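User: I'm putting together a small comparison set for a docking exercise, and I want a reference complex before I start. The sequence is below, and the ligand is magnesium ion. Could you produce the 3D structure with the ligand included, as structure tokens?
Assistant: Of course. I'll restate your input first, then give the structure tokens for the complex.
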Amino acid sequence: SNEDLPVPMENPYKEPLKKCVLCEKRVDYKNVQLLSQFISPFTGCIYGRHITGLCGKKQREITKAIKRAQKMGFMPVTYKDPAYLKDPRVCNIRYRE
Amino acid sequence: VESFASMLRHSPLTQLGPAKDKLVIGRIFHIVEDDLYIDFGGKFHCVCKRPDVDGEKYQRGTRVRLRLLDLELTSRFLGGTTDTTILEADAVLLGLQEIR
Amino acid sequence: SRFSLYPPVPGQESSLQWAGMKFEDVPIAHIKATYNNTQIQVVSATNASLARASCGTEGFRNAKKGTGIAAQTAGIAAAAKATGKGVTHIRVVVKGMGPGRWSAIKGLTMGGLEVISITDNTPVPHXGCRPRKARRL
Amino acid sequence: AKHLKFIARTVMVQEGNVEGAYRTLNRILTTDGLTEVISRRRYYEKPCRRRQRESYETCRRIYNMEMARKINFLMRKNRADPWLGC
Amino acid sequence: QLKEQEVLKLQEEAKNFITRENLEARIEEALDSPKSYNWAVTKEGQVVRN
Amino acid sequence: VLKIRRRKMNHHKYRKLVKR
Amino acid sequence: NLLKKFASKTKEDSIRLRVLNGLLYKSLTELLCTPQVSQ
Amino acid sequence: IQDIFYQEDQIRAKFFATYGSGQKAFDLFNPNFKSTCQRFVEKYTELQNLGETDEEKLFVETGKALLAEGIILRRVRE
Amino acid sequence: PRYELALILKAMRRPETAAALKRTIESLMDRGAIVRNLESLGERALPYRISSHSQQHSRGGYFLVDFYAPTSAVENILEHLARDIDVVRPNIVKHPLTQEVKECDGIVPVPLEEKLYSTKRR
Amino acid sequence: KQDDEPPSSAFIKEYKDIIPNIEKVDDVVKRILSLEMASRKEKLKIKQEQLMNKIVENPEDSRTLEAQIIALTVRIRNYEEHMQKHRKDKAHKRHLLMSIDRRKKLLKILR
Amino acid sequence: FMEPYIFGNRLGQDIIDLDQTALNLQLALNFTAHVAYRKGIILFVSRNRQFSHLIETTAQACGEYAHTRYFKGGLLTNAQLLFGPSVRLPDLIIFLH
RNA sequence: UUGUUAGGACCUAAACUCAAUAACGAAAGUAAUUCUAGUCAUUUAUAAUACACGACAGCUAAGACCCAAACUGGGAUUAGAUACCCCACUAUGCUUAGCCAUAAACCUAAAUAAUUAAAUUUAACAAAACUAUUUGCCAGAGAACUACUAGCCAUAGCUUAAAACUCAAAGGAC
Ligand code: FES
Ligand SMILES: [Mg+2]
Ligand SMILES: [Mg+2]
Ligand SMILES: [Mg+2]
Ligand SMILES: [Mg+2]
Ligand SMILES: [Mg+2]
Ligand SMILES: [Mg+2]
Ligand SMILES: [Mg+2]
Ligand SMILES: [Mg+2]
């Protein structure tokens, strides 16, 4: 009929979905340096997923690892260890104005 | 006579592929204060702001360079059964095209 | 080469000294700011009491005992007692969230003491004791 | 009670600006939600009321974000009239 | 094939398991070499071991 | 509206009567 | 139903009003001494 | 509604992922405009008519042919 | 199954620390275990002050012991280690390596409309 | 009790037919892959397989009514052992009574 | 009700079959000619303000009428009150928009 | 008594942030940590006179007891306070064994498989509509979550559930 008619196919130009910072990375309770990047420096409170930027799965993984680390004598509870204050910033939170 | 299906396949707009982060040439057809209305060959025009450098050069008929983002700005909002369109395109004016 | 809001880390070497004292040595001003009375106690870094004051001891009574100006007087009174004992720099640990929480710290400054840091120790239970029932008014 | 004292919830005064230190400590304790927690924990909120309150906040936050999105989506179309006289 | 390989891998790994004979020697090797599980990520998702 | 109030008021008068 | 819900287009008094006035003042003063309401 | 996808789009998608959009700007007012990407697809087709069956072979050979033509193709991973 | 022990030990000199790790690992073997690896993480300051056996501790030596044991031995091991006077805090968990990092494509956009079907009902 | 209980030296169902082929395997490796270092769930997969061989004509098929009945007898006897220790577990007491009733329904269709 | 006329969706932008457009446009132009031939009144109607002056200039060139402004309620259903007792309504309305 | 304690003891009770999450369970219900046990295939719908469960409050017995708190006492308030507010304190909330079987036990939606067009706002409002299958249930309101009856560890209890008589309405959504 017509050679120029469009051909059914999956979108070639499809854009890959957006991954979180921890996508496909092991989250362990002993890696307190990674865990400390998602708590508050002053209170030690876990940040929500609107701050950490994580997905549901990794948000739950970090939460379960911080609590296990805190309960097994690896991580503090009421603050962030001063030795990890220098690590990079991944969380969308600015205490200073 | 060429068929419509052939025309669409070989059309410059069909060749562009996705219009995000593409480079295109536009023409200024309407100016309102420091807002330039630029036709880049699509359905909807874009509207950019006159650059501080060489502001006087951007007059009507002047061909410029653009970085497309969307061909039409549209978005569905809560409680809407159809998309809300502002009947405008999104592009970033980069500067005048060298006549050469 | 910038100021750090975070306090010095205990057990490390720092260049920050106040009146030839390290951070761990600077005396502590314990402010208990409740909704009725604001108490203040100043202690040395070895936990020895030096000054004490409160809105009640100043002479305020009942609802006046729980105002901002009442706590300010208590801080100025605690400062004067502390200044006599030989205290120039204090670490302010403010427990409680009452009306004279800030005013007590402002009185201490007016009394001639130099605050170098402000800590908060308001009790926050992690799940704890059932609070009293809501008031119906 | 078992942790180290003066690391948690401690700000440092810069150049004797004792008020600025306190005002920053307040912004910290509020951003972290400790302020609301201490206020609400004065009296007992019953489990049924806590769930009603949290469901309302979530729906309130969703509606305030979408309405802001609609206003910000049409922020650019608010410009000088190009077709004045028509 | 997969299960045969998995069994063989465990057999090779079992060479270096601890036993009563090599307990004290393996204890001293562990004390000599500390290990670290700490690492951090950037906003780009890149590990940053120190 | 008045139907639960009436069940309540009717139920209230039965519990009082049972007590007497 | 969110849009429907949140559009929302459609001597006793003397002693009671001496307690609400005092308490509301006590409470609103505390609200404004923190960033809780707003910065 | 049929999604309009021609067979050239498979080639065009690879070109945009490997080299991005040609540094020359698209002119959508010229009805017969030939972009750098459309020339890549015209040469890629010619080689495929000869009978090359490997997509990798057709992608690197077309790049060499355009390099001889003088077109500046930058393999921008960024 | 495969379990990872997390053994915080009292801060001691190497002679006594080595004796503590020999006595400990021997107990695992006596309970029918197959010890696979021993790792040290170093002496450090505890995140908080842990009180064990009528002594307050601020520093301890962190160690990991990878091993296999029946499901019935896990409880007996923890009971024995809790009675040891050189053990600040023993914690047995299922070995992390037995758990495999899942494969994720990405975050698919969720329409808020299908979140007000979720949240309005809640 | 029942006539057959899997020995502790038996290999798990994944490696039941793989280790015999391997020429030589260490005692430790056999012990890691035995039923001593496995969960109770693994020991139940061996009990079921033993019964399927001894009863079903074609043990390869597990969708037959006779095979489904065998699957529920292992679960039923498992829930009973659970309930002998957890006397006040009401979720598992329900699981036991619902499987018993399920087995009766399947035995009725088979008959 | 427009899906019959849409050739397809080119990466989010619906494309309009120009073969149906030619057939429909032929009928519409033929009908517009017979109406104009018989001396009927033709009213061009649009509310797009970019093309308000162009459409008013076109109507004047043709010899017909244009209404590109705010449309009063009742203009056609209550025309006698608005325009007069014997006002003749349009015989054809061309909606550019 | 108070404040401080980087002093000691206790291991009672409850589980911040995470949670802007929407998972698990038949429902009730369930989110401190770890480990053990553990949810799984009947084609699908359809069950009581049987079996097993069932928030909170309450009963029985032995314990626990930080805090909260019916009742009770004290203080104030008011023409009166038998309440609201303040202080003290008990049953009770907890554990171990039973019992009781009640909720606006509500998503005020029986389950299951369809379809989205039948020119279906087929009242309105909720939650778009609608077909088929099977069971349960309903037939004006009040009298009546009542009387009597039978069953039940329930004894001021629960489930089951009328009539006389009265009215011309009751009721629902806007
Ligand atoms: S987006 Fe892949 S794990 Fe978070
Ligand atoms: Mg307890
Ligand atoms: Mg298990
Ligand atoms: Mg009591
Ligand atoms: Mg409900
Ligand atoms: Mg009842
Ligand atoms: Mg009755
Ligand atoms: Mg009866
Ligand atoms: Mg009747």
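The longest helix of chain F spans residues 2-19. Residues 8 and 14 of chain F are 10 Å apart (CA to CA).
User: Thanks, that's exactly what I needed.
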